[PDB]
A paper describes a structure:
Interleukin (IL-), an IL-6 family cytokine, has pivotal roles in autoimmune diseases, fibrotic complications, and solid cancers. [name] activates downstream signalling pathways by binding its two cell surface receptors: the [name] specific receptor, IL-11Rα, and the signal-transducing receptor, glycoprotein (gp)13013,26. Following the formation of the receptor complex, the Janus kinase (JAK)/signal transducer and activator of stat (STAT) and extracellular signal regulated kinase (ERK)/mitogen-activated protein kinase (MAPK) pathways are primarily activated. [name] and IL-6 utilise a homodimer of gp13026,34,35 while other IL-6 family members exploit a heterodimer of [name] with a second signal-transducing receptor, such as LIF receptor (LIFR), OSM receptor (OSMR), IL-27R/WSX-1 or IL-12 receptor β−2 subunit (IL-12Rβ2).
To understand the molecular mechanisms underpinning human [name] signalling complex formation, we solved three structures of the complex containing either the cytokine binding domains of [name] (gp130D1-D3) or the complete extracellular domains of [name] (gp130EC) using electron cryo-microscopy (cryo-EM) and X-ray crystallography. We also obtained crystals of the IL-11FL/IL-11RαEC/gp130D1-D3 complex that diffracted anisotropically to 3.8 Å. We used the cryo-EM structure of the gp130D1-D3 complex to phase the X-ray diffraction data by molecular replacement. Three [name] signalling complexes were arranged in a triangular configuration in the asymmetric unit providing 6-fold non-crystallographic symmetry to aid refinement. Satisfactory density defining the positions of the β-sheets of IL-11Rα D1 facilitated refinement of the domain in the gp130EC complex and the crystal structure, confirming the average positions of this domain in the complex. N-linked glycans were visible on IL-11Rα (N105, N172) and [name] (N21, N61, N135) in all structures.
Author numbering:
A (entry chain C), F (entry chain F): 3 to 131, 141 to 294
B (entry chain A), D (entry chain D): 4 to 301
C (entry chain B), E (entry chain E): 15 to 178
The structure:
């Protein structure tokens, strides 16, 4: 019959300045059919002679956008087609992330909207110098802008492949990603500040690992603490050992802000975002 | 060809000991001039050796015996009194004297940041002899490279290999000279407990906020923080004070890059200085940082 | 084990030195792309769970990789070209720390009475660089491969302590 | 195998000049990725080179032209934009810049007693390039050994051959660096006129006789008296005076080892100092001797 | 002649250096008796009036003797034994001044267009000393013979000026 | 006949503790002769039987010193002999000197006097390693204690040979002498001191060569001057160029002593003795 459609079953698409070839959907290829412009009785023609299964338009300009009707010579409506004009997709914008050392996930956005139906094919491979060829990245709920890779090699390098395709062409975004470079843990949770009786200028801060980071002897986290008294403009920075740090220069009688961030214990990736500030006041 | 020789060739002996030198004449030389041991006279450094100290052993050889040797350098010459009115040289030797090396004591080492391990020791009594010093260090599974002291610094050596923390190393010094060989006691230690960090740099004082009587000290710690945990000593005094005060060590007992000093008088100028060393007190204190000045708010 | 504790502390030290010099190098001589060398090992093929594996293979595997890296680091210094003299004396200090750690690894196996692996056949000589810049490009591949090996080394040694 | 290279390998150019760099891609590399010169982007030290400075010559090569070069060190990298969403390095080079060496001026030499001939010169404008300095000296019938300056003292050299008086020697300094070679003017002189003797030693004042107001100065002249005739300058002042006086040179215009100073006040303390140089004034004055004190008779 | 004046001044300088080192040596290492060596020249055979002789023989004769002495002085330094290191650096300075003066003598003959003597056959190597003290004894013979040669050299050169 | 005598024609000599053999001077060897002690009629005997040409005394002690008479059996006085006892000569003491560069001369003294007639044989040779063998040193006036060698080699070494012989034995003194070592010139002559008008503390000293030193371009002399004001204890030393030296530190109004000495210009031998002092006084 004719090239099967992209989206809905009886609509075809085209680009300005091109040649566009409409087909009559519910008509056997080879049956002669007639074409009309909506509201206009003229039998339309196209570059290959005058009576086919498909109308063609070399014009392709904006006035040519609208609804077209094809019918067989008996009078039976063989179908309707709508010509919507547009442009091929632009290169999409792709980012990846990883909050743990095992799995990571990537997301993508169009860099330009065409007004045409759009969808994404995602895949990835491991560059070398076990089928390490192209492996699909399945999009977990529905067809969201996110795929997850489980059990990735931590030190190996992956070439992530997001390819945008529309009814008029394709454009592929490729993003190199290594688990050891992209990793960024979540901030610690439960930051609490307590007074230290007997010491008017000490506070004890304590906290735990983030829940997204399972405590394991293999991947610790190092920590970086910053603290600042209310109304003060400048942060003070310490590099605490362990999950606690006694501040010894707290200004007496003043609320103090304290925040902490996390990073892989072997300085892989980058420091987390700062935790929500927690406040305390020395005794 | 020569008439004879003196034996031993060039001896070195210990002070207050005895030395016997024997000069022997070849038969051919004795025959031409018609002489023997009885014609030998000994002279040294323009001083005639008294005939009474000689001992004629064979018709070919005469000998002398020195007691309680006290000269650091003796030039010995053996001569014969030809046809009773001339003297010709048979042989000569140089006698050097001194003392054996003393056992090196108070051996200690130090690892200055950016430099290789350096060890120091107390040398003992002067020996008057050319003495070479070689610093020895070796693992149980590897014999390490010798460290040869420099002419300028004969009591110190600086190894040519980079410092390796967290591994016990066996070190000792070997003193040896012509009169004797001896080794110092062996020491064993982890280089991590002998570090001498550089002093803090990038010292900043910062002015006071909307509250006065408070100053926050900031600085950049030395790169060595990646291997050891730092401890500090912060000293401060008023611009006019004569002595320095000090923050209680317990409050500055762990790595940090800032500290806010309190209870200072308003609109008063303060001078600060800081030093650091390994948190456990095992090692050496760094030098004092650059001086810093600051002013309290109004 | 006290002996295992000491060896792990020294490995973390060497990893930090390698990361700093590799990052310093890219700041002065930027690299565009992931560089590889056929003569370097490409044994760093595994995921997270790889901790699962047993002790003899890990120690044997670590020993083989590090000996190749030592040859390559020493090769870089004597013949890498005047362009890389700026990476001294830090590069020479890095070389010296690595030879001793290999010795420490052989001692660990001896003290624990572990079977020693058979002496593998040493790799042929690395060809000299084809240009001064080729040596610089080779350095990026070597340092990246080294610090990855060391990163996985720290993790593996810590896992064994968790079992025996 | 690599995709291409940049030529010239590692150029050095003069400040404010122009430099054109050409990057050429191998056919094989262009074929696999389906690219050509138009895909080359140039970046240096984290700064993107603006596309407008590029010039695509062949389908295999792109080129850029720098004008009024002002950076001392340029790291140049050639890159290709593969399949429009990645970038891989083709080649790289390091560009060094600077200035040619200036003509050495004010060349002068000095022969310090006990040391080998030493020459000094004024270096000119900084060149920012590694510059070697070699001191040249040669006779009409012999080319002499080069003198290579020391890292610490790049503007001075001390030859390794002993000084030979009474023979004219041709000396000059040769300055050369990657951007140019130049020689200083040649000088010609007899080492005998460039001697810097040591200062007098063994200074003695001697007390006064049965006549007062007279002091005789004695000292030991330097060994150098065997080659040149010495001249002296004797200065003296009262223990309380602020400035030194001086004996008329004509009275001390020839070699001597003593001098009696007259017309000094009785029972007064006097301080003396002396210096010497070649009698004809051709050479350099020695340093001042050790100070000497004396007292007149009663 | 200005050229002859310059050469005579340098000869007096070398004579003084040789006398001082020879006298210094006997103070530290006394000598008992007049020492001789078969390999040293014994050409210093003449009385006072010998000034009478002509110029070609004197210059040829001076050149041959000094070349032998140069060989012997250099031989003493490299192999005389550690006993004589105390005679440095003065002995090495003495050696250097003598080679150049020989060169100056060849130049004098060239500038005056004098027939050059035929290249005589160089003397075979001196055997090494049989002992350290044998080298010291050899030094007394060499220095005494040298300073005598130089003493007669100063006198002879001054006589030629008196005629031409 | 009998061993011919040493000194006078009819006296013989002997050593204590030896055997001494007197001969009758004017008697044919083989004629029997008789011997008497002066004032004593006893016919003397000796170890070889009793009637010879020669009396022998093995006694030889001091009582045996005196006059002996020998006569033939006819009564004719065949001669008289005197036995004087003594000892062989001691080694003589020899010194040499030279005040010029051409000739030198040596002198000798007995180290011990025997009381017996004595004479000296002198000779010398040139050690090598033209008959350079032993050459006699002729004693110029009479048989004085001095010989002269003319046209000696300046640089060669000579072994001087003084051999003492007496009627009972010999002893040879050998003295090595080289002209370059022994030379010592005479002091300069005619030292004069003059005032220097206009300069109250300068004096000009002038002098000439000594007459024993012929001025010649081949052997100059260097000079060493010492000067000292009257009543001063310490000499001042200068090394003048040439035959003149202007002193510039003369004490005003005081007589000054000046003396000079000479040495070979190439520092051969030793400095001369000091000239007689000459005095002058600054203007
Ligand atoms: C990144 O991933 C995307 C998606 O997998 C890749 O697009 C893929 O491109 C290849 C060409 O290399 C397509 O192969 C096909 O071959 C057939 C037979 O010749 C032809 O009919 C197609 O037109 C196409 O050329 C493949 O279909 C296409 N993937 C999808 C889902 O359409 C892209 O190549 C990847 N880039 C990498 C891994 O560097
Ligand atoms: C130093 O000079 C004196 C005097 O010339 C030397 O005394 C001389 O000694 C030689 C022996 O070497 C005497 O030779 C004679 O030989 C004959 C024949 O055998 C014999 O009858 C003599 O009794 C003696 O041995 C020589 O006569 C004698 N000179 C004189 C004037 O009596 C002495 O040897 C010389 N020493 C040297 C040059 O070292
Ligand atoms: C005379 O004494 C010398 C000195 O002891 C003897 O030479 C020694 O001989 C022994 C063996 O015969 C050697 O072990 C020594 O080394 C020799 N001494 C020296 C200094 O070389 C010599 O043999 C003796 N001669 C006679 C005839 O008794
Ligand atoms: C494209 O341009 C390059 C650069 O000039 C050409 O390569 C040069 O070729 C000449 C001789 O053919 C050599 O002397 C130069 O040394 C080459 N340049 C370099 C940088 O090596 C190349 O031939 C050109 N190709 C075409 C097809 O025109
Ligand atoms: C990684 O994926 C596995 C596979 O289901 C999962 O069990 C694990 O929880 C994931 N990791 C994290 C940190 O959620
Ligand atoms: C010789 O040596 C012995 C032992 O070393 C010592 O007792 C003695 O005093 C020395 N001197 C002599 C024996 O003159
Ligand atoms: C040490 O002893 C050796 C002995 O061979 C000697 O050569 C050397 O000069 C001495 N000193 C040094 C610094 O080596
Ligand atoms: C290129 O070089 C020429 C001559 O060296 C100079 O005049 C010009 O300014 C430079 N720059 C250009 C043409 O952009
Ligand atoms: C001088 O230039 C040479 C070029 O080969 C270089 O190797 C050397 O390091 C430079 N400096 C010195 C002091 O030789
Ligand atoms: C040396 O002897 C010769 C020979 O007669 C004599 O002419 C000359 O005057 C002497 N020398 C001196 C300085 O008297």
């Amino acid at each position: 019959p004719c090239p099967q459609a992209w989206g809905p079953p009886g609509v075809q698409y085209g680009q300005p300045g091109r040649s566009v070839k409409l087909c009559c959907p519910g008509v056997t290829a080879g049956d002669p059919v007639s074409w009309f412009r909506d509201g206009e009785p003229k039998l339309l023609q196209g570059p290959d002679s005058g009576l086919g299964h498909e109308l063609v338009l070399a014009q392709a300009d904006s006035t040519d956008e609208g609804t077209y009707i094809c019918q067989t010579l008996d009078g039976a409506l063989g179908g309707t087609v709508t010509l919507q004009l547009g442009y091929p997709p632009a290169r999409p914008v792709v980012s990846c992330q990883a909050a743990d050392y095992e799995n990571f996930s990537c997301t993508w956005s169009p860099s330009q909207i065409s007004g045409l139906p759009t969808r994404y094919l995602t895949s990835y491979r491991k560059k070398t110098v076990p089928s390490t060829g192209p492996w699909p990245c399945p999009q977990d709920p529905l067809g969201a802008a996110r795929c997850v890779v489980h059990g990735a090699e931590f030190w190996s390098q992956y070439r992530i492949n997001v390819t945008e395709v529309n009814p008029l062409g394709a454009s592929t975004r490729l993003l190199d990603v290594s688990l050891q470079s992209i990793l960024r843990p979540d901030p610690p949770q439960g930051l609490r500040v307590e007074s230290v009786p007997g010491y008017p200028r000490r506070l004890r801060a304590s906290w735990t690992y983030p829940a997204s980071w399972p405590s394991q002897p293999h991947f610790l986290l190092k920590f970086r603490l910053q603290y600042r008294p209310a109304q003060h403009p400048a942060w003070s920075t310490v590099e605490p050992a362990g999950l606690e740090e006694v501040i010894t220069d707290a200004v007496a009688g003043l609320p103090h802000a304290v925040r902490v961030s996390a990073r892989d214990f072997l300085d892989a990736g980058t420091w987390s975002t700062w935790s929500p500030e927690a406040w305390g006041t020395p005794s | 060809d020569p008439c004879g020789y003196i034996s031993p060739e060039s001896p070195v002996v210990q002070l207050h000991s005895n030395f016997t030198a024997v000069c022997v004449l070849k038969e051919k030389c004795m025959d031409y001039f018609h002489v023997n041991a009885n014609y030998i006279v000994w002279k040294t450094n323009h001083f005639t050796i008294p005939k009474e100290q000689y001992t004629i052993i064979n018709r070919t050889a005469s000998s002398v015996t020195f007691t309680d040797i006290a000269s650091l350098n003796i030039q010995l010459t053996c001569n014969i009194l030809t046809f009773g009115q001339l003297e010709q040289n048979v042989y000569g030797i140089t006698i050097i004297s001194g003392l054996p090396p003393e056992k090196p004591k108070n051996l200690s080492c130090i690892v200055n940041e950016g430099k290789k391990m350096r060890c120091e020791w107390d040398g003992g009594r002067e020996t008057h002899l050319e003495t070479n010093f070689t610093l020895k260090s070796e693992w149980a599974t590897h014999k390490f490279a010798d460290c040869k002291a420099k002419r300028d610094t004969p009591t110190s050596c600086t190894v040519d290999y980079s410092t390796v923390y967290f591994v016990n190393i066996e070190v000792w010094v070997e003193a040896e000279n012509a009169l004797g060989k001896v080794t110092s006691d062996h020491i064993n230690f982890d280089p991590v407990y002998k570090v001498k960090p550089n002093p803090p740099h990038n010292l900043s004082v910062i002015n006071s906020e909307e509250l006065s009587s408070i100053l926050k000290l900031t600085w950049t710690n030395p790169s060595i923080k990646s291997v050891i945990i730092l401890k500090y000593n912060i000293q401060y005094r008023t611009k006019d004070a004569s002595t320095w005060s000090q923050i209680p060590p317990e409050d500055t007992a762990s790595t940090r890059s800032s500290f806010t000093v309190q209870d200072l008088k308003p609109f008063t100028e303060y001078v600060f200085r800081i030093r650091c060393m390994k948190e456990d007190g095992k090692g050496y204190w760094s030098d004092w940082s650059e001086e810093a000045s600051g002013i309290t708010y109004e | 084990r006290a002996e295992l504790d000491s060896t792990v502390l020294l490995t973390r030290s060497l990893l930090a030195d390698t990361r700093q010099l590799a990052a310093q190098l890219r700041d002065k001589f930027p690299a565009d792309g992931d560089h590889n060398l056929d003569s370097l090992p490409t044994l760093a093929m595994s995921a997270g769970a790889l901790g699962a594996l047993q002790l003899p293979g890990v120690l044997t595997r670590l020993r083989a990789d590090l000996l190749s890296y030592l040859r390559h680091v020493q090769w870089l210094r004597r013949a890498g070209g005047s362009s890389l003299k700026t990476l001294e004396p830090e590069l020479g200090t890095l070389q010296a720390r690595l030879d001793r750690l290999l010795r420490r690894l052989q001692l660990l196996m001896s003290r624990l009475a572990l079977p020693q692996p058979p002496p593998d056949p040493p790799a042929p000589p690395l060809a000299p660089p084809s240009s001064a810049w080729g040596g610089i490009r080779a350095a990026h591949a070597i340092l990246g491969g080294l610090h990855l090996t060391l990163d996985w080394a720290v993790r593996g040694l810590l896992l064994l302590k968790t079992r025996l």
